[PDB]
CSV table of C-alpha atoms and ligand atoms in Angstrom, one decimal:
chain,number,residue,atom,x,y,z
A,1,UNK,CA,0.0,0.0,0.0
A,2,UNK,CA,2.6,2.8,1.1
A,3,UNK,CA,5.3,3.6,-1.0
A,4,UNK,CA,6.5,6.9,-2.1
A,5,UNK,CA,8.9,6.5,-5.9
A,6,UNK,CA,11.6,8.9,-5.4
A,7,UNK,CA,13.2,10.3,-8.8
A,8,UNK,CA,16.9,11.7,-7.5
A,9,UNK,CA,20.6,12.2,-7.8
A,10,UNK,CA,23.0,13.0,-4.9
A,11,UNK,CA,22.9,17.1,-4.7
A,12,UNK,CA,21.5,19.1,-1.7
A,13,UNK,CA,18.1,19.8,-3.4
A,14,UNK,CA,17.8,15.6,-3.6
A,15,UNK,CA,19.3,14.8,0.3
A,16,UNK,CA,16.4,17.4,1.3
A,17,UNK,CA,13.7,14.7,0.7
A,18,UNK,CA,15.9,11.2,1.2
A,19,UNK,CA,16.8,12.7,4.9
A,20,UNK,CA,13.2,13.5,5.6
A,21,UNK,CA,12.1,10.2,3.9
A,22,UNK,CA,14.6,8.5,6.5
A,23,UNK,CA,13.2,11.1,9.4
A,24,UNK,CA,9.8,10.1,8.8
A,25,UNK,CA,10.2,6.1,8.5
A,26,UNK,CA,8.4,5.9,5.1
A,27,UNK,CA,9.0,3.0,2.7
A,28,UNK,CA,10.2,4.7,-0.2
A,29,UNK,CA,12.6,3.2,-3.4
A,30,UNK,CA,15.1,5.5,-5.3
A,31,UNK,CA,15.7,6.0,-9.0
A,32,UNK,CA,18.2,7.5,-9.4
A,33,UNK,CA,18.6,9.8,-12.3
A,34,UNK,CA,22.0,10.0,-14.5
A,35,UNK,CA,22.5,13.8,-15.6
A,36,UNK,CA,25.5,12.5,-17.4
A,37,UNK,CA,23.0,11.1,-20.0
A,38,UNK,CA,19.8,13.9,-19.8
A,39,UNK,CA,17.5,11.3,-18.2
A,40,UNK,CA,16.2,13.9,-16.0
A,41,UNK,CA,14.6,15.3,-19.5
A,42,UNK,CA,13.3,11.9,-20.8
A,43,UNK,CA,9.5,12.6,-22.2
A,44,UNK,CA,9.0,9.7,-19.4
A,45,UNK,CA,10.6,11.8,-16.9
A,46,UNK,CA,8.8,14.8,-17.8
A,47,UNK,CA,5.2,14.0,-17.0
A,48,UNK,CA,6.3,14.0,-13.7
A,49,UNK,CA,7.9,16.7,-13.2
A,50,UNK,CA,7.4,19.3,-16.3
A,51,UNK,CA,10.2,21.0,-15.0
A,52,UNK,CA,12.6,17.9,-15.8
A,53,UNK,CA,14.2,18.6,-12.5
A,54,UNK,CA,15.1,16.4,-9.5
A,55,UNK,CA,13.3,15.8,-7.1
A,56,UNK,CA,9.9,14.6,-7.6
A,57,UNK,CA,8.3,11.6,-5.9
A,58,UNK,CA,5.1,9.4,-7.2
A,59,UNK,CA,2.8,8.6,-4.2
A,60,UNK,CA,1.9,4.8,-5.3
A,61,UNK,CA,-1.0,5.3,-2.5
A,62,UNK,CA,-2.6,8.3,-3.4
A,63,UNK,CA,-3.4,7.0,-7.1
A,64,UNK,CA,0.0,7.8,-8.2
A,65,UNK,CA,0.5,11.1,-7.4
A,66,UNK,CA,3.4,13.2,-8.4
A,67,UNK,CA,4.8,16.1,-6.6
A,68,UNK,CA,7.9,17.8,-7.7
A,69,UNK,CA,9.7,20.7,-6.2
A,70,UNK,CA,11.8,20.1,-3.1
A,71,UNK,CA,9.8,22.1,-0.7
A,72,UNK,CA,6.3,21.0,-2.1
A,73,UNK,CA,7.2,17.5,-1.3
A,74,UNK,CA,8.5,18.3,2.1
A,75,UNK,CA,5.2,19.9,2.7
A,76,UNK,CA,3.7,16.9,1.2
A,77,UNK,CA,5.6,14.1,3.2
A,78,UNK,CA,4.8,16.2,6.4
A,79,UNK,CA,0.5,16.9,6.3
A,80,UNK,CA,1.0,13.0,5.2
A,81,UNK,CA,2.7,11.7,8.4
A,82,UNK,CA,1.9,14.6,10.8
A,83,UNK,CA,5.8,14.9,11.5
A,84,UNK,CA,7.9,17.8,11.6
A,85,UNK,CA,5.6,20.7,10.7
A,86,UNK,CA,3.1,21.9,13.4
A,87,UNK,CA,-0.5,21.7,13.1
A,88,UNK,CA,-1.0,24.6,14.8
A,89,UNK,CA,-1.6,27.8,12.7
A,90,UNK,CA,1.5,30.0,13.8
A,91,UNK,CA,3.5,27.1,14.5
A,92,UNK,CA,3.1,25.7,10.9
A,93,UNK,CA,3.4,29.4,9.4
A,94,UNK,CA,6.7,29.6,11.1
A,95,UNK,CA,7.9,26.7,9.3
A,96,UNK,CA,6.7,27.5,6.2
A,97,UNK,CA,7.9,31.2,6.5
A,98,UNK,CA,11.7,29.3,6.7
A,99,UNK,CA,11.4,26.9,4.3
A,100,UNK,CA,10.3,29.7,1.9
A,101,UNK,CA,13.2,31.7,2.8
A,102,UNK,CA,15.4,28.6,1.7
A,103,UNK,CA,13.5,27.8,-1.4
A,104,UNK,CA,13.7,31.6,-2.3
A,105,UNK,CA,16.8,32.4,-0.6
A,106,UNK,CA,19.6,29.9,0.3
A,107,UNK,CA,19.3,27.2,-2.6
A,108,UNK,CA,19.0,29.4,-5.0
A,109,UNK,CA,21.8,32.0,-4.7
A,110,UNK,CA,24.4,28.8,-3.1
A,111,UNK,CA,23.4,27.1,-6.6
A,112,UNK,CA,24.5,30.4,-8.4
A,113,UNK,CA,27.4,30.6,-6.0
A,114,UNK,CA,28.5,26.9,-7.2
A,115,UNK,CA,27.5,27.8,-10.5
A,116,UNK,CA,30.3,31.0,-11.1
A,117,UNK,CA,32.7,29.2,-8.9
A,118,UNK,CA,33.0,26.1,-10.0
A,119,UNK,CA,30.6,25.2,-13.2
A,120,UNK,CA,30.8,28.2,-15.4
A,121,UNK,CA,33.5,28.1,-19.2
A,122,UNK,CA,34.5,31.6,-18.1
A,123,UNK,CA,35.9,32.5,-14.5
A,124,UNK,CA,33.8,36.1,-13.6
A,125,UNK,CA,35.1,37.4,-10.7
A,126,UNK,CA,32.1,39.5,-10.5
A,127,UNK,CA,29.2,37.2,-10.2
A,128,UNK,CA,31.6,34.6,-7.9
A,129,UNK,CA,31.4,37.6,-5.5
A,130,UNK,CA,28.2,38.7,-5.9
A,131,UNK,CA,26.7,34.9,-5.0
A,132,UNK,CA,29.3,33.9,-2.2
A,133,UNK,CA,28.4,37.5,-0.6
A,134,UNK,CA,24.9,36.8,-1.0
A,135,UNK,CA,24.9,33.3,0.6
A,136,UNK,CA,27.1,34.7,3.3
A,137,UNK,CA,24.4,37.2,4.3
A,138,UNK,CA,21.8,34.9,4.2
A,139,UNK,CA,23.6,32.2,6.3
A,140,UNK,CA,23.9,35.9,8.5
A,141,UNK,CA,20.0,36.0,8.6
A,142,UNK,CA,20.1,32.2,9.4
A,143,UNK,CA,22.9,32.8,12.4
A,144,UNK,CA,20.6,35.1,14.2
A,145,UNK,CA,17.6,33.7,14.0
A,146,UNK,CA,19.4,30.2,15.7
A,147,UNK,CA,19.9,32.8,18.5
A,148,UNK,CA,16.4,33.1,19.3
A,149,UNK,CA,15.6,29.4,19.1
A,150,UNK,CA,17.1,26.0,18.7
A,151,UNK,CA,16.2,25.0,15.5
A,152,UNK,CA,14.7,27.9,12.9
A,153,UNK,CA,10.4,27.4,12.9
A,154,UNK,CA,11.8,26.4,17.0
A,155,UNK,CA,11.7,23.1,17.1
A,156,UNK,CA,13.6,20.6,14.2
A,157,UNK,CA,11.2,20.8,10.9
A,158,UNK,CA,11.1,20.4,7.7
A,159,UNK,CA,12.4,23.8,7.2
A,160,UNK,CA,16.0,22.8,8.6
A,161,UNK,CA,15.5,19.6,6.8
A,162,UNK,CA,15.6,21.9,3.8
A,163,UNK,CA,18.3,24.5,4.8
A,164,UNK,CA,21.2,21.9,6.4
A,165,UNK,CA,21.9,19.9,2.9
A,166,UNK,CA,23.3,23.7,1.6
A,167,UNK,CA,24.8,24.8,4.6
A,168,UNK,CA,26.4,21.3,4.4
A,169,UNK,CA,28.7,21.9,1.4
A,170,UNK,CA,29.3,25.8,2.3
A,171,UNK,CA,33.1,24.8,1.6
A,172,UNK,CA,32.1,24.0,-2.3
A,173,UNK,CA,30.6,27.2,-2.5
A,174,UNK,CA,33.3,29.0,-1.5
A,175,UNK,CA,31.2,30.4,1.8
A,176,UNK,CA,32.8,30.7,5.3
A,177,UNK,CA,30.8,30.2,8.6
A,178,UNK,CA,33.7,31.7,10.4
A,179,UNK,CA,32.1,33.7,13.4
A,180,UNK,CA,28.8,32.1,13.0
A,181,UNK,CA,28.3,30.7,16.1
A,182,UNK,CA,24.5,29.3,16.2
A,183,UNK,CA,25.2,28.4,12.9
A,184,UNK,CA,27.8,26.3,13.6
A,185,UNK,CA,25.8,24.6,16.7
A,186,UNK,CA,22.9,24.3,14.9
A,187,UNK,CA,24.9,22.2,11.7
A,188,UNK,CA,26.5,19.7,14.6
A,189,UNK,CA,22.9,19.0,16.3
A,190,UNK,CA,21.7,18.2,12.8
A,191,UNK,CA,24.4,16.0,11.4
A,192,UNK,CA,24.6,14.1,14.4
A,193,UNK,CA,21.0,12.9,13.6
A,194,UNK,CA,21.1,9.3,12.4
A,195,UNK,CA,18.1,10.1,9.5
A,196,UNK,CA,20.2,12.7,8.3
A,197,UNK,CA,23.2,10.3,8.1
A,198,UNK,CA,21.2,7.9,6.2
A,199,UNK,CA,19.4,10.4,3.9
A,200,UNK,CA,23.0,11.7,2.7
A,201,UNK,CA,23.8,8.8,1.6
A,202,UNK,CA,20.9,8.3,-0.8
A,203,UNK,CA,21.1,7.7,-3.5
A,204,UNK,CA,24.5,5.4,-3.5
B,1,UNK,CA,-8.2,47.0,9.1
B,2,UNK,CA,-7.2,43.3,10.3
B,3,UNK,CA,-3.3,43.5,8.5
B,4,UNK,CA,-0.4,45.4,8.3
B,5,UNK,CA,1.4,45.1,5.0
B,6,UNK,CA,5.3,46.2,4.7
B,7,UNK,CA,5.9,46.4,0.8
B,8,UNK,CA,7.0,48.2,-2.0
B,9,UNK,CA,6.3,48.5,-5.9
B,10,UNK,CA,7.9,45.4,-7.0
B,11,UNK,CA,6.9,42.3,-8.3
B,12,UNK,CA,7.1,40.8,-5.1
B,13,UNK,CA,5.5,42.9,-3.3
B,14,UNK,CA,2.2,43.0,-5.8
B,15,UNK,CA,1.8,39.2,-5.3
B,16,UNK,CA,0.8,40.2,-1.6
B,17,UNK,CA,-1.1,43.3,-2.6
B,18,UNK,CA,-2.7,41.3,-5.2
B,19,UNK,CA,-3.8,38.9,-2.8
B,20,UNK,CA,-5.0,41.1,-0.6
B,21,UNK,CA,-7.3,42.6,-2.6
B,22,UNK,CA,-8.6,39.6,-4.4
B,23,UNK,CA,-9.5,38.3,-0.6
B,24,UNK,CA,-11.1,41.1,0.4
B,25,UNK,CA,-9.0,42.1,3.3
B,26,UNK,CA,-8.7,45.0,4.7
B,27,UNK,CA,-5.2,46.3,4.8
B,28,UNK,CA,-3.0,49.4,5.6
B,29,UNK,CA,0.3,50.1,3.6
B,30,UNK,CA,3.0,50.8,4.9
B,31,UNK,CA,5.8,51.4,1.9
B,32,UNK,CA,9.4,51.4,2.7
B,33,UNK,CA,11.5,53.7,0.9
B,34,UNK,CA,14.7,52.1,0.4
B,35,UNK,CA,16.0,55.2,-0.8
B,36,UNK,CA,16.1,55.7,3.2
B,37,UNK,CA,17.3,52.5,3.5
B,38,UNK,CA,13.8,51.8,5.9
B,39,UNK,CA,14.0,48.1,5.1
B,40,UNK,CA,17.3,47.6,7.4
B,41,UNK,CA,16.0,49.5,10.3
B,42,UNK,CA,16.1,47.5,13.4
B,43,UNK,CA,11.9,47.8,14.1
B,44,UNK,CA,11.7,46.6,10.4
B,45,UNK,CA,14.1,43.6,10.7
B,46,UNK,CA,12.2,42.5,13.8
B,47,UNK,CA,9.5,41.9,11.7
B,48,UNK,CA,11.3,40.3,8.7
B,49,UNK,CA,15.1,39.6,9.7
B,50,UNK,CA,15.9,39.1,6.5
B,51,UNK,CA,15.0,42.7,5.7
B,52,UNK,CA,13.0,42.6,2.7
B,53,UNK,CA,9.7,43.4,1.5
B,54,UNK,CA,6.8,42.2,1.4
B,55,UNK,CA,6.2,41.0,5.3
B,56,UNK,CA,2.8,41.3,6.7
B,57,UNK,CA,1.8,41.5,10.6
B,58,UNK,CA,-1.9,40.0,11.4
B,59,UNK,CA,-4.0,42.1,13.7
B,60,UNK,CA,-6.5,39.8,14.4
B,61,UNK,CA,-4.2,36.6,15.5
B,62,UNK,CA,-2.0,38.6,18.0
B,63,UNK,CA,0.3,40.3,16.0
B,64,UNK,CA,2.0,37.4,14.0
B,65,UNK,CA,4.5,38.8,11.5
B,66,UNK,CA,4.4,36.5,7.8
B,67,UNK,CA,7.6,37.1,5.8
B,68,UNK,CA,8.5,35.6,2.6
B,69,UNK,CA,5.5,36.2,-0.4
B,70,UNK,CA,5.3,32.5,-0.8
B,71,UNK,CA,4.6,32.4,3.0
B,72,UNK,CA,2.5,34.7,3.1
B,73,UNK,CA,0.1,33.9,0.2
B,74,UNK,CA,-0.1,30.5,2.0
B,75,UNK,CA,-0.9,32.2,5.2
B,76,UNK,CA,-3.9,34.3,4.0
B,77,UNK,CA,-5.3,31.6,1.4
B,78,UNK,CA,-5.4,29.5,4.8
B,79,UNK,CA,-7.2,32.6,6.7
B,80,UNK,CA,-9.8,33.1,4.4
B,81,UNK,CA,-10.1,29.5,3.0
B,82,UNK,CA,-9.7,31.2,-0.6
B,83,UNK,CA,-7.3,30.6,-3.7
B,84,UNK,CA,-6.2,27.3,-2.5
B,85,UNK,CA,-8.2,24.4,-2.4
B,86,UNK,CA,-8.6,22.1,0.9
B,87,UNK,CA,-8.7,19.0,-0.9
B,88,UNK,CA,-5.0,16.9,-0.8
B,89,UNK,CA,-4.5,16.8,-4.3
B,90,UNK,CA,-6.2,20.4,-5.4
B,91,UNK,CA,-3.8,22.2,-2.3
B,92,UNK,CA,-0.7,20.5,-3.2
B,93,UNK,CA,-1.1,21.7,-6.6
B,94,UNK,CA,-1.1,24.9,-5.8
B,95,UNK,CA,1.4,24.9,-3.6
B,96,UNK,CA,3.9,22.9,-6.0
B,97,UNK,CA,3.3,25.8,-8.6
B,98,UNK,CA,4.3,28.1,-5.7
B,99,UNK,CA,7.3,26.9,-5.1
B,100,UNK,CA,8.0,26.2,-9.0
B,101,UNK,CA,7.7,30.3,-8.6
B,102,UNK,CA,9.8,30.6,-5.6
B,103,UNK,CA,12.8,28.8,-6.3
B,104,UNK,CA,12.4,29.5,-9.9
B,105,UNK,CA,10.5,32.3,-11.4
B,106,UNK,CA,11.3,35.0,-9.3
B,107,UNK,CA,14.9,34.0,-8.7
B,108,UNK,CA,16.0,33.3,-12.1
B,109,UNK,CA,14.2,36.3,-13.8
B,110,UNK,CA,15.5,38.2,-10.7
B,111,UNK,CA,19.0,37.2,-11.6
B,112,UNK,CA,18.5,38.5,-15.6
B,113,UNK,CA,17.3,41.7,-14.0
B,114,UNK,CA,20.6,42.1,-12.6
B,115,UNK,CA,22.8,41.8,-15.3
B,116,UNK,CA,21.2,42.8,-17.7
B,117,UNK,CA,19.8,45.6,-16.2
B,118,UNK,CA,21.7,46.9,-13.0
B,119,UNK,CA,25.2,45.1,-12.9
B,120,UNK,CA,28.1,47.2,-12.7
B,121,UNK,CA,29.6,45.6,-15.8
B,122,UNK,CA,28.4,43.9,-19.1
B,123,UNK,CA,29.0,39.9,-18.8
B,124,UNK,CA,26.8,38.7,-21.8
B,125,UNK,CA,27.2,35.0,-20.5
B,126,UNK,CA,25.5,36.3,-17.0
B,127,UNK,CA,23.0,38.0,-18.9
B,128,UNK,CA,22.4,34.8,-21.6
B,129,UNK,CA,22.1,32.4,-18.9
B,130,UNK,CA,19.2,34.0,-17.3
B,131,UNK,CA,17.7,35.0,-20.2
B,132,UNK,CA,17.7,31.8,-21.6
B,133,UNK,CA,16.7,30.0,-18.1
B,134,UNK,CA,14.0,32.5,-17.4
B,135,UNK,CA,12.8,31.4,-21.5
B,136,UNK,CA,12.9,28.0,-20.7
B,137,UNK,CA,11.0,28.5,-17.3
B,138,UNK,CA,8.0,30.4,-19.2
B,139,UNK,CA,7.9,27.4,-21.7
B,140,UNK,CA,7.5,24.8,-18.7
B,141,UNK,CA,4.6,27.3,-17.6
B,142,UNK,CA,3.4,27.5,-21.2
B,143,UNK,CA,2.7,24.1,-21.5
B,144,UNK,CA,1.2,23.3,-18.3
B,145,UNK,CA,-1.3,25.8,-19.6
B,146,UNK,CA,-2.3,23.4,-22.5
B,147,UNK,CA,-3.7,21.6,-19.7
B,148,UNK,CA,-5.2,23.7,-17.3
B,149,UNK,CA,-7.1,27.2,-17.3
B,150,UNK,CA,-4.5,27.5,-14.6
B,151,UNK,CA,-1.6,26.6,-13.2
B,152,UNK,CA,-3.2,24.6,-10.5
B,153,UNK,CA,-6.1,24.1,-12.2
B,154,UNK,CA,-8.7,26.9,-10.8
B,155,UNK,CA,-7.2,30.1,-10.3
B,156,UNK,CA,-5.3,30.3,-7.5
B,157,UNK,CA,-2.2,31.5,-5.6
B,158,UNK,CA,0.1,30.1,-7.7
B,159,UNK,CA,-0.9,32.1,-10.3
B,160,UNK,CA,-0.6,35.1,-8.5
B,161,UNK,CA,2.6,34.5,-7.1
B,162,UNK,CA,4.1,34.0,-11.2
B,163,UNK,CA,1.7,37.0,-12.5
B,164,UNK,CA,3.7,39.9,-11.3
B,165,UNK,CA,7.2,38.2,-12.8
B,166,UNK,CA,5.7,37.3,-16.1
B,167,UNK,CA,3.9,40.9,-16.7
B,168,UNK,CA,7.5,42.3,-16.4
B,169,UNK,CA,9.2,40.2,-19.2
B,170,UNK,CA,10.2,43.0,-21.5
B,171,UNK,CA,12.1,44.6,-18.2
B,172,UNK,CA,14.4,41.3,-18.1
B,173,UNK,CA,14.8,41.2,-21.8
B,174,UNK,CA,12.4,37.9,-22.1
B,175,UNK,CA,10.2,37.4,-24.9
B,176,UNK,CA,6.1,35.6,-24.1
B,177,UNK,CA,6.1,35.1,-28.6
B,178,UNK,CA,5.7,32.1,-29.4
B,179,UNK,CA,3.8,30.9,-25.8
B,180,UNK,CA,-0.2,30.8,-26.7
B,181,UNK,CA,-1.1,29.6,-23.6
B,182,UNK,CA,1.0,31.6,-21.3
B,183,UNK,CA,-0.4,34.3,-23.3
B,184,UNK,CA,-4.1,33.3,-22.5
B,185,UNK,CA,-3.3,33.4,-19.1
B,186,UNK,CA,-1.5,36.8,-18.8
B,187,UNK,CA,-4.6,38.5,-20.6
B,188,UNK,CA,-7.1,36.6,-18.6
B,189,UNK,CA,-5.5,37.9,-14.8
B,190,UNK,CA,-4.9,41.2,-16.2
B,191,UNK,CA,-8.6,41.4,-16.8
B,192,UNK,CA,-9.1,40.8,-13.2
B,193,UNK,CA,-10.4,44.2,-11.1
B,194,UNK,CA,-8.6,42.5,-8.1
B,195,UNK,CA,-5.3,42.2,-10.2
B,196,UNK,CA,-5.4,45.8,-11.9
B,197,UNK,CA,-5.4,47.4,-7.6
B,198,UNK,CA,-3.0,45.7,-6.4
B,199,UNK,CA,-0.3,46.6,-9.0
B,200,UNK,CA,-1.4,50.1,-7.9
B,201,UNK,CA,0.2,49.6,-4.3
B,202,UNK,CA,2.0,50.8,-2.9
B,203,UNK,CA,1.1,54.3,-4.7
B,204,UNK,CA,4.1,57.0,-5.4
C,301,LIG,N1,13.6,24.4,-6.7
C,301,LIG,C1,13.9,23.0,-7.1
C,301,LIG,C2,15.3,23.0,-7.7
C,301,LIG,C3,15.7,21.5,-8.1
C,301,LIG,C4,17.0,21.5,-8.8
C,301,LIG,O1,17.6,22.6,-9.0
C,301,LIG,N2,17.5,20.3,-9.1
C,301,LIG,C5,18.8,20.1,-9.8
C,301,LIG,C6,19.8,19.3,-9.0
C,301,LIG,S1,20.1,20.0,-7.3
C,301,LIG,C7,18.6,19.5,-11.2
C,301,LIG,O2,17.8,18.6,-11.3
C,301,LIG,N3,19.4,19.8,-12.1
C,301,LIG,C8,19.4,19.1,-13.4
C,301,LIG,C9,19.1,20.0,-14.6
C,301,LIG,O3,18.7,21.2,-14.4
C,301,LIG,O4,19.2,19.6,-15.7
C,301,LIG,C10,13.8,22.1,-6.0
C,301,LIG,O5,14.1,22.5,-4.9
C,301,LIG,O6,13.3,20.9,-6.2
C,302,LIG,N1,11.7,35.5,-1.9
C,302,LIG,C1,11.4,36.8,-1.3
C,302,LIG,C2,12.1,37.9,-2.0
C,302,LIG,C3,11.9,39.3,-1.4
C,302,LIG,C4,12.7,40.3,-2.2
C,302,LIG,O1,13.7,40.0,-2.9
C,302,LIG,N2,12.2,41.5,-2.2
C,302,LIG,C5,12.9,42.7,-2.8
C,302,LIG,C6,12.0,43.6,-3.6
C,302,LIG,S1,11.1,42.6,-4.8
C,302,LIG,C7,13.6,43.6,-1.7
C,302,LIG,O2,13.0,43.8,-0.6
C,302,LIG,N3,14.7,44.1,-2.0
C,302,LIG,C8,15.3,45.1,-1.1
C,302,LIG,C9,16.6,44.7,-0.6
C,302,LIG,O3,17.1,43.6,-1.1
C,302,LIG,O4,17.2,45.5,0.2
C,302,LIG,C10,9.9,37.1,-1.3
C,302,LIG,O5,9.3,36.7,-2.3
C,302,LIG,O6,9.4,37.7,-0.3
């Protein structure tokens, strides 16, 4: 009956669902999706996500239902098992308010950060700057808001679920946590956590 | 009034505006000039620390600050039970073309606005790339409007979350030719009363 078909391919955006997958106990198996040869643009691929990006699931018990975009299916995976997102009206605002500021935010100016540093023909100093000073201030914003609580929406969510697999590879992106002391706390609680450790490492 | 909105006349901000007067709220502007730098003031950043616009602080549920559009659509569809549906499948929809706009939309065409427009120096590359993504973004929406009236099938908040980046294609150098569908869609919301006042705050 339960299964959620996980369309993936180890980069931050696909570790955000595997680790809540693994958080969340739910029977789940991975295909895994070779960039190297386009299959994440296959016609197959495409009618579940349009966007013929990773990742998307298929929820074999809900009549096959796709969901693509990261924090869609975190959203998803969470109203499903009533885990890690609040029921309560502020509390689940706060979570979504977080994982919108990672969706908007963090993954997308990192990925332009990885992009310029370490993807692009041409090396532009300009734009290299631009995104690594960008991501710095927002893992500024993210700094002092794990002053005021323990994990960002207060307790562990979805929304950290989303934010820890960038934070993670900081290094790649050429961005420095140096002085970023609730930061730096609040990325050893979470890679301590033995779903995170598992999700990582999916898919192999 | 029951909200306080914090905005200014950009796309993002016209998504909440939008939505605001679509629901029938009442509201009260309150338009940062940036030219003042208003949007880093310490009272502002306690109400979105990442100090951006829009950010919205409910009245009626004790003063609870909503930052981040995507959030905050969310957060008043939920209030007022319009523009989303309840059902599992009908809300997820919506919400999966919100975040398709979050993480996509707005950054990407964000990011062609800046070279192209405002960068300190001419990098055609920079400016291709996000030309060509934002192109290739429109044509994803395009053809999900072969299927649907909308994006998530009724109108909803996914389509005003896109609206305000689309209607400003010819400011990021981005052609709609060629996209009948997309094209439907842009003339049928800017037919909408509801659409035509929000783009009007905040007012110069
Ligand atoms: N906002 C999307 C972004 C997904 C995304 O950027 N996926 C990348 C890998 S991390 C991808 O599939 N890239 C392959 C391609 O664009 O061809 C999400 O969070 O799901
Ligand atoms: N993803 C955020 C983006 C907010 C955003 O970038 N807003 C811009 C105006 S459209 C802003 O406040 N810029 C002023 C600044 O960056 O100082 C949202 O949708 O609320």
């Amino acid at each position: 009956m339960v299964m959620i078909d996980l369309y993936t391919a180890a980069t931050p955006n696909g570790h955000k669902v595997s680790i809540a997958l693994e958080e969340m106990g739910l029977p789940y198996r991975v295909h895994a999706l070779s960039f190297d040869k386009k299959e994440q643009k296959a016609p197959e691929f495409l009618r579940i996500n349009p966007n013929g990006r990773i990742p998307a699931i298929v929820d074999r018990d809900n009549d096959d239902f796709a969901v693509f975009e990261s924090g869609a299916i975190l959203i998803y995976l969470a109203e499903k098992t009533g885990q890690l997102m609040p029921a309560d009206v502020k509390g689940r605002s706060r979570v979504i308010q977080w994982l919108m500021f990672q969706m908007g935010g963090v993954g997308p100016m990192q990925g332009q950060a990885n992009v310029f540093f370490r993807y692009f023909p041409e090396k532009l100093q300009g734009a290299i700057d631009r995104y690594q000073h960008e991501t710095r201030r927002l893992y500024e914003v993210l700094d002092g808001r794990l002053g005021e609580a323990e994990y960002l929406a207060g307790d562990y969510s979805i929304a950290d679920i989303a934010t820890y697999p960038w934070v993670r590879i900081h290094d790649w992106s050429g961005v420095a946590v140096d002085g970023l002391d609730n930061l730096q706390r609040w990325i050893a609680a979470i890679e301590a956590r033995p779903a995170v450790q598992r999700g990582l490492l999916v898919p192999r």
